[PDB]
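From: lab user (bench 3)
To: helpdesk
Subject: output format question, protein + lead (II) ion

Hello, I'm new to running complex predictions and I'm not sure whether the block I got back is the full result or only part of it. Here's what I submitted:
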Amino acid sequence: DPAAHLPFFYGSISRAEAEEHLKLAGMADGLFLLRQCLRSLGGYVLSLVHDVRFHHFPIERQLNGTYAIAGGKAHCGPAELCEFYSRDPDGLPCNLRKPCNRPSGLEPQPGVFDCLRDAMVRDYVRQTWKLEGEALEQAIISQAPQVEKLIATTAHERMPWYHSSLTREEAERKLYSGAQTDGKFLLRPRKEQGTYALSLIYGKTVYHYLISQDKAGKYCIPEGTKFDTLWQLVEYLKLKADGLIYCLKEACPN
Amino acid sequence: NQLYNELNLGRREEYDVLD
Ligand SMILES: [Pb+2]
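Helpdesk reply: Thanks, we reran it on our side. This is the complete output you should expect:
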């Protein structure tokens, strides 16, 4: 990760954890930290304090490898972006003053998605090129970036909560037939390609939410947060309801 | 299409953008 060496990069942490660190640091204006985006591939989130209030700016990695905040100037990397904004606010509520450096003994938190994608890329390369040992190791380094998107967009298909073929009726039959604990969910594809449904049980009642991908290829429940992959959507909604009646808890297996 | 539930827009997580 291009930002792993930055003392103010916290890795894959939540907004809550990020705000906790900024609070414990004094809540000074311009105080900021960088964390890995939980919604996009290779993105970051700039978290800063101003007027005793938190501001979170998602940083997207452009196709050409640069990084930029929505409507902002692109930069060749996360460090250069923070350096630029230290000098010129250029749209932010205030310039970046004083990085919230990681406390001694605290390292950046590894992302679960990155960790799982590693295994998947290895397996894909091994099955396709029939390589092993150092040979496999060299190949994964050479192929990883090229097959990255492919593995990420299809990662959901390997998760327990994904059901390749379930109608609304069958989905309800599975959710109702069990412990019926709040947050029990499953993801299923719909007839029209590009659309899926999130079905969860809350208060002995099953809710179904439509998920569709826009022209940009991003997924979302109508009027909701957008994600690069279905895996990220589900994982995000496990942390916060973000509009849902209740957040995702237990996965309803195969 | 069918009877799908809507998001309670009042509980959505807000992200900032440049002004
Ligand atoms: Pb892990």
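A quick orientation on your result: Chain B is about 0% helix and 0% strand. Let us know if anything else is unclear.
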